[PDB]
């Protein structure tokens, strides 16, 4: 009868993000003539903590090639970039941990991150801490590159997209237990208003589709179709299987 919580996170009143203490966007350099023909050297002044982000940033400062000034740009810091390291953006840049290169210029097996989907959207894929994509093949005809995303989804993208070499700093962040409730509170007070999550079985049928009963039980089957109406999708969405997963890793 009522509007339920996931229908209610879309108006964006109190469920908007909490961006005050964030340093900025975490993009790469805007692809210009120096980066698709040669290289360009930026020094890393200050790697900083981003509020709401597991990885640390890196404020690499470059020389503006067309007017005399310095442009500061916020990368996501790969693991092992000491300050004062020269970071070389461009096509002819060498392959060291922290340099950002086109994917058609690296060999296979190269562990890169912050990689673009389409060439020039400034860092879409593989940004969270610990993650990386792995170039598993080239296709030099129509300049494509076949990589492996962090989820284990293989994907072919264009070889003019740019990735920065090396895994992302801050790895192993969720290997530590978060023992108390206040520590999860102080985690989710800097991201958005999505905590505590009340169970939908614990509430009334106006509040939720799972709601109500004389026992706390789901009711009908908790797997809801992909094509259901927005407002029923509260449970499991389009589950192709369920239950405790069984099967060894390294699949075909």
């Amino acid at each position: 009868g009522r509007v339920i919580r996931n229908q209610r996170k879309g108006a964006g009143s109190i469920f908007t993000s909490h961006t005050r203490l964030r340093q900025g966007a975490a993009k790469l350099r805007t692809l210009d003539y120096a980066e698709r023909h040669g290289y360009i050297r930026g020094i890393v002044k200050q790697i900083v903590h981003d509020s709401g982000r597991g990885a640390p940033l890196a404020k690499v400062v470059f020389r503006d090639p067309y007017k005399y000034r310095l442009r500061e740009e916020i990368f996501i810091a790969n693991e092992g970039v000491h300050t004062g390291q020269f970071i070389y953006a461009g096509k002819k840049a060498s392959l060291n941990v922290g340099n950002v290169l086109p994917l058609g210029s690296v060999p296979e097996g190269t562990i890169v991150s912050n990689v673009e989907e389409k060439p020039g959207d400034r860092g879409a894929l593989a940004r969270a801490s610990g993650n990386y994509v792995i170039i598993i093949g080239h296709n030099p005809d129509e300049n494509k590159t076949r990589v492996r995303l962090p989820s284990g989804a293989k994907k072919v993208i264009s070889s003019d997209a740019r990735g920065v070499i090396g895994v992302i700093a801050g790895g192993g962040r969720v290997d530590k237990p978060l023992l108390k409730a206040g520590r999860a509170f102080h985690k989710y007070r800097l991201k958005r208003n999505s905590w505590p999550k009340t169970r939908g079985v614990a509430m009334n049928p106006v509040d939720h589709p799972h709601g109500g009963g004389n026992h706390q039980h789901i009711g009908k089957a908790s797997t809801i179709s992909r094509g259901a109406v927005s407002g029923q999708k509260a449970g499991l969405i389009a589950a192709r299987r369920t239950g405790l997963l069984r099967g060894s890793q390294k699949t075909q």
């Binding site: 092992g80 192993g172 290997d175």
Partner: peptide
């Protein structure tokens, strides 16, 4: 040094540079 979250360079990262 931007590093691992609890140690300076985690074990799944220090191999990567050797790969490099």
């Amino acid at each position: 040094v931007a590093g691992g979250a609890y140690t300076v360079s985690t074990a799944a990262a220090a191999t990567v540079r050797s790969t490099i």
